[PDB]
Amino acid sequence: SIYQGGNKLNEDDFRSHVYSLCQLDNVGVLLGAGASVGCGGKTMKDVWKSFKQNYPELLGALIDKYLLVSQIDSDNNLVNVELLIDEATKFLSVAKTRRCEDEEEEFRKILSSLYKEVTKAALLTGEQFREKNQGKKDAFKYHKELISKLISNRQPGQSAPAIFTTNYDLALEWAAEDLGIQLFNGFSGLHTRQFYPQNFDLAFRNVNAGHYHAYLYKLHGSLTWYQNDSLTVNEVSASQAYDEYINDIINKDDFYRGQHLIYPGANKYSHTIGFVYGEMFRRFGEFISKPQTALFINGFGFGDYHINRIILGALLNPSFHVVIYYPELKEAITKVSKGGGSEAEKAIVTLKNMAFNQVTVVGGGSKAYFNSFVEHLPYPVLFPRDNIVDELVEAIANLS
């Protein structure tokens, strides 16, 4: 089911539109949490189910006393988990100063339980998380196609691609490290790696003999980012993180340090940690407000108010074009046209019904997925779809 302005389309009018759209000045991508299910990840409600199975005792002190969640949502599995840890951190910070010892333990013990459950779901390889060359495995086969197709079709004098994402995992990095590409994420150094926001404006250049690089924005954080002293934020490697903190989290129990982690949007009240989150949305708007721009979306559930606000405000500029993927149009149209559904359904539906030739929505269940989004993108001509490399490397290694 394909709709442009309410009216329907056919695959051959759609594939001839994607190509016209990918030839523009600025191009971008915005992914989500579903894109990472073909690799070993999970979804936010499959997280809540597992939480309330194993920890049903702490689930009363959270609905009765402190009013942190509602029963309808707890029953229908419609809870935001990145918006609750922040509030709990606020509560704990307040209790530390107010000096009420009867309330700090009961929050340590229920934050140790939430972090243990969100971390375990982002490794994507289990105990094979601290090893090397995890981008050769076949699970990461389309993340490479995406990058390669986005790069291989640009011309001289045209800006490079940007990739925004809400996940906090390491797949795109594991893939680029195996393709031989460079991604800029705002950090510099190896023995001490630090955040420099002034280097989203840099680029490469060759002297005599280059344009293999891209920009990556992560909107909620990462497991490799942390804070040691007041004024700075540091990045490390997987093998180093696993040995410092990520292990006790899983195995040990009743382990919680404090304002030390930068995932997901948790300690947003300090002034050294929110400076990192704000720059990303800043650059998002500054990109989405240029002329001759195109944006593809996939994996996003539309449960955030600010991003929808930004997009709707951006659509006033006549040179902005969008493409969306939502495999529940039918299951939502009725639930919203009879009496009403949920804010996500309402929002996503308001766009289907407009007089716009620069909007587009796509459905079909397993036909609007990631392994199929990656296949509507054009493939270049000179790019080789053949591998006489491995047959030579095999002989080089067999030589003896």
Binding site: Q155, G157, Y379, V381
Partner: protein, 102 residues
């Protein structure tokens, strides 16, 4: 271009390139695509010769596009007007024994 599983050659003279580009040579595989036809018409194709500058590619033509309207063969004496008729005629006979030629 490249559409579904192969290539196709369009003939329209307007896609001027951009500065700072890179010019490259053509191999012997981007040349058949140029001097080739559709591949559903191969059952209706006859072989005439090869390219003269390189002598690598082979040339095929569609019978129902040749012998639909009339055909002109022009040439001076001693250069091969009668060696092309005895080749275009002893092929339609070996391919379509239900045919009337005079």
């Amino acid at each position: 271009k490249r559409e579904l599983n192969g290539y196709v050659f369009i003939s329209e003279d307007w896609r001027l390139p951009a500065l700072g580009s890179s010019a490259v040579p053509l191999t012997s595989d981007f040349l058949n695509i140029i001097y080739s036809i559709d591949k559903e018409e191969l059952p209706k194709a006859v072989e005439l010769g090869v390219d003269s500058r390189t002598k690598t590619v082979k040339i095929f033509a569609s019978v129902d596009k040749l012998l639909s309207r009339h055909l002109a063969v022009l040439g001076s004496t001693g250069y091969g007007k009668s060696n092309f008729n005895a080749l275009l005629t002893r092929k339609v006979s070996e391919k379509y024994p239900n045919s009337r030629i005079v």
